[PDB]
Design a protein around this ligand. Structure first.
Ligand SMILES: C[C@@H](c1cccc2c(-c3ccc(CS(C)(=O)=O)c(F)c3)c(C(=O)O)[nH]c12)N1CC2(CN(C(=N)N)C2)OC1=O
Ligand SMILES: [Zn+2]
Ligand SMILES: [Zn+2]
Length: 232
């Protein structure tokens, strides 16, 4: 009833949206992995009379439910999607999106890693993002490659109209106690990559992590802190 949703408040197999700013929503779904349940976030950004989607809802059925929830709550067509790294919480559901007429995009690095590891593969490559500090425009957002962090391919997304920074899985929520799933991470480079984000988006007003609750700029420093302590 207005609070940021968690696993306890999302009915089984469903998705919830949360209004972040004018024309900006997050999407929240839950999924089981290795016998535990986790929430995960994505982003929706109004693009005129269309919508840009950032990240799937972690799974085919969750992503179909996402599309239904968008139609119910917003009622504008999703025409493009960007996946911000190659893991299943970002690309799992790309096949559903593609069959629903959504053009799917990711960096060439993400596409290669998804293909090699057996995850679903976005159709279109996003050039211009291969060096840390690179930025490109994509509809109503800027895409930024901060360097290796949670994964070597992770992208962040900024919504300039609203000063919303979507960190994806390179950014953790304030309550986090460790650096999440570090299977593919570069813990030594991650603080440098977060520093780049801090330097590039100093006016961010809302910071959204890949999993958990949004907050302010403090999520960036907190992320650096938990990652350094994890590595240590
Ligand atoms: C789908 C995703 C994932 C699956 C299951 C869980 C997660 C988390 C996560 C875990 C705990 C917390 C609470 S916290 C910050 O307090 O620790 C959190 F916020 C996020 C994250 C994230 O951190 O993004 N991703 C997850 N995969 C699976 C994989 C890849 N692989 C191989 N062996 N190959 C493991 O790597 C990874 O990321
Ligand atoms: Zn991941
Ligand atoms: Zn993640």
């Amino acid at each position: 009833s207005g609070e940021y949703p968690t696993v306890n408040e999302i009915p089984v197999g469903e998705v919830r949206l949360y209004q972040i700013a004018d024309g900006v929503w997050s999407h929240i779904a839950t999924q089981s992995f290795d016998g535990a349940v986790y929430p995960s976030n994505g982003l929706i950004v109004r693009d005129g009379d269309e919508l840009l989607l950032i990240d799937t809802a972690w799974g085919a059925k969750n992503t179909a439910a996402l599309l239904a929830e968008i139609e119910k709550q917003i009622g504008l067509p999703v025409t493009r999607a960007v996946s911000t790294h190659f893991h299943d919480d970002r690309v799992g559901g790309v096949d559903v999106l593609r069959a629903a007429g959504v053009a799917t995009y990711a960096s060439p690095s993400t596409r290669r890693l998804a293909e090699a590891e057996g995850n679903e593969i976005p159709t279109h490559s996003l050039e211009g993002l291969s060096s840390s500090g690179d930025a490109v425009r994509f509809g109503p957002v800027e895409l930024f490659y901060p360097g290796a962090a949670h994964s070597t391919d992770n992208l962040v997304v900024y919504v300039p109209s609203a000063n919303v920074l979507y960190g994806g899985c390179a950014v953790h929520e304030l309550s986090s106690t460790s650096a999440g799933n570090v299977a593919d991470a570069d813990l030594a480079e991650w603080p440098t990559s977060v520093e780049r984000i801090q330097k590039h988006y100093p006016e961010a007003e809302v910071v959204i992590p890949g999993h958990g609750l949004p907050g302010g700029l403090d999520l960036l420093q907190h992320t650096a802190n938990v990652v350094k302590a994890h590595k240590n």
